[PDB]
């Protein structure tokens, strides 16, 4: 049944079963929507509470999506999820380090275990998602850790696809938003005033379409990829683009990363969810990456979508009424960088 | 025959102003609702005293089985040719005894309308429509009944079905 037997759409089948582990958060809800609209079964392992997995139940058709509970501490949950799949996708990743899990676990130990069972179960593809510009000694606890794992993944389950996306924008993101949120607290306290650091941002759908195409693309095997996105923007300009599109006053008062590092520490202390933290602060200001030679969305078949276009949808909320109705051509025009 | 529905001495004029000023006529309604808090509520204790039904009550389908143990369904297709919601697919074979039985039977209980056109068409009394009505489900897949969720279903209520069939067979 890897023979797709139907007109494309729900109720067809493209015959690729898949275990998409991080399908409770931000990126996986789009992956299930594409894998799903592609009518492929998706065994979605959820450790969450069912009330929060419902939003996934309609992104599929009768029987397409199957759910089962998995906790990273114990295997056999990883084993049974990947037992009947042929595709496996890893989207596990947390910004903060909850008392129970370290960047160690969510980025190395776990993906390793999943991939372990993946190879053990015979799944052909272990699409894994590590961050762009994320290598060892990248001076950020997570990014460094993330790359360490990329190796563990490769070692155990070779011939694996590894996507390393740039910052991911799109609704419900924590990229544009973190910057947008600054409105609430004072003004944007951008380090380097936001200059001197450039970020390539890619829409969630562009990454999601890429992961789906990769699961079904033969040449993709053993191929790393970088989903950079269409334009490289300096941080100060992008925060200014978030503002104006947010329609709230902008003030890029500077300060050193070390202060903001000490600062976020406290925000991280927040028990529920850090509003920001040292690791995040770092990956924003210092983190900057120039892709050089990796296939990318175009290669995998996606036309990266510029941020100039789909920014209404993710910032139209952050406007006060009386500005909500503001259209796009009105939005403060942005500009791209090379650096 | 037709009936009209809506068609001054001081005695009458004072009476009108005694029913407009010292309202006396909204009082005949307040005493009317006071007449009901003192009566016995009709509410039944629901989970413990389920309401009354009839042997005719049409609910969850089930496939009856001959007392011997032989499925009664002989795959006529006299019950999807009438099922107006177009809910039943009963692909069949010779069962390798030489006999005639289903390999497939189906209701999509999210399309059925509990009309009982399948229990009155069946010339053998195989498919019935039982007196269940507590079979709600948290998912969509638990309503697409197969021949084994209808046959063991009918291997459940047969003590409770046959009493109602035997109770209504004459009227049918």
């Amino acid at each position: 049944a890897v023979i797709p037997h139907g007109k494309g759409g729900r109720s067809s089948v493209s015959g690729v079963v898949a275990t998409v582990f991080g399908a409770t958060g931000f990126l996986g809800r789009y992956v299930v929507n594409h894998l799903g609209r592609m009518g492929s079964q998706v065994i979605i392992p959820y450790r969450c509470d069912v009330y929060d997995i419902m939003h996934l139940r309609l992104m599929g058709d009768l029987g397409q999506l199957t759910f089962l509970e998995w906790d990273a501490r114990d295997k056999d949950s990883i084993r049974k999820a990947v037992q009947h799949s042929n595709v496996v996708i890893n989207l596990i990743g947390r910004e903060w380090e909850t008392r129970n899990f370290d960047f160690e676990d969510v980025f190395v130990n776990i993906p390793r275990a999943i991939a372990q069972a993946s190879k053990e179960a015979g799944v052909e593809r272990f699409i894994h998602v590590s961050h762009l510009n994320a290598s060892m000694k990248s001076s950020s606890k997570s990014l460094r850790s993330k790359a360490v794992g990329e190796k563990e993944v490769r070692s155990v389950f070779p011939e694996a696809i590894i996507i390393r996306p740039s910052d991911i924008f799109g609704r419900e993101d924590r990229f544009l938003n973190h910057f947008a949120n600054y409105r609430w607290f004072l003004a944007v306290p951008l380090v380097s005033l936001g200059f001197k650091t450039v970020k390539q941002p890619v829409y969630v759908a562009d990454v999601s379409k890429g992961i789906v195409n990769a699961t079904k693309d033969p040449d993709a095997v053993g191929k790393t990829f970088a989903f950079t996105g269409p334009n490289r923007y300096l941080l100060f300009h992008l925060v200014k683009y978030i503002f104006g599109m947010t329609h709230r006053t902008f003030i890029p008062y500077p300060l050193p990363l070390f202060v903001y590092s000490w600062i976020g520490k406290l925000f991280g202390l927040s028990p529920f969810e850090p509003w920001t933290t040292k690791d995040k602060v770092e990956r924003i200001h210092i983190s900057d990456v120039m892709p050089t030679d990796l296939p990318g969305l175009e290669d995998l078949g996606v036309q990266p979508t510029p941020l100039e276009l789909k920014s209404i949808e993710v910032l139209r909320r952050h406007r006060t009424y009386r500005w909500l109705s503001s259209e796009i051509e009105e939005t403060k025009p942005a500009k791209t960088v090379n650096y | 025959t037709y009936k009209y529905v809506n068609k001054v001495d001081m005695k009458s004029a004072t009476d009108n102003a005694a029913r407009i000023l010292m309202w006396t006529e909204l009082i005949r309604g307040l005493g009317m609702t006071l007449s009901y808090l003192f009566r016995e509520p009709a509410t039944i204790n629901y989970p413990f005293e389920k309401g009354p039904l009839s042997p005719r009550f049409r609910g969850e389908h089930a496939l009856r089985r001959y007392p011997s143990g032989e499925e009664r369904c002989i795959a006529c297709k006299l019950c999807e040719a009438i099922c107006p919601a177009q809910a039943i697919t009963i692909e069949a074979e010779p069962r390798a005894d030489g006999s005639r039985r289903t390999t497939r039977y189906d209701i999509d209980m999210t399309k059925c309308i509990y009309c009982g056109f399948c229990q009155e068409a069946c010339p053998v009394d195989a498919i019935v429509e039982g007196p269940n009505f507590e079979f709600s489900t948290e998912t969509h897949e638990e309503l697409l009944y197969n021949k084994e969720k209808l046959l063991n279903n009918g291997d459940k209520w047969e003590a409770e079905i046959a009493a109602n069939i035997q109770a209504d067979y004459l009227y049918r």
């Binding site: 797709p4 007109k7 494309g8 609209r37 949808e313 909500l324 259209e327 796009i328 | -």
Partner: protein, 114 residues
């Protein structure tokens, strides 16, 4: 052969209506984007309008063009008013639908249907 006119007698006469609708729509697209908080750009939409008014650009039976205007105008009424929500209007853009390939090799490669 002879045929009663629906509203116009000669194709030319009717086209007068076809243009009096184009203008209307054109002058409305801007309004809709803003009113229905649609996200597509004025230019983008106005493109769609031409496309449609263009899609039908081959019939020569006045009665048919006399009829598509009406249907056409009706669609304005609804859109001019907000009788149609965002969902309705945005459906003209096949946002989710994956455009079907046309190349033979592109179809042979997928789906037994031609």
């Amino acid at each position: 052969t002879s045929v009663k006119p629906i509203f116009s007698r000669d194709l030319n006469e009717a086209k007068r209506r076809v243009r009096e609708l184009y203008r209307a729509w054109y002058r409305e697209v801007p309004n809709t984007v803003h009113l229905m908080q649609l996200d597509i750009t004025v230019k983008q939409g106005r493109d769609k309008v031409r496309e449609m008014f263009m899609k039908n650009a081959h019939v020569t039976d006045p009665r048919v063009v006399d009829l598509l205007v009406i249907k056409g105008k009706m669609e304005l009424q609804e859109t001019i008013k907000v009788w149609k929500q965002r969902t309705h209007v945005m459906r003209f853009f096949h946002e989710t639908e994956t455009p079907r390939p046309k190349d033979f090799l592109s179809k042979f490669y997928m789906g037994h249907d031609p």
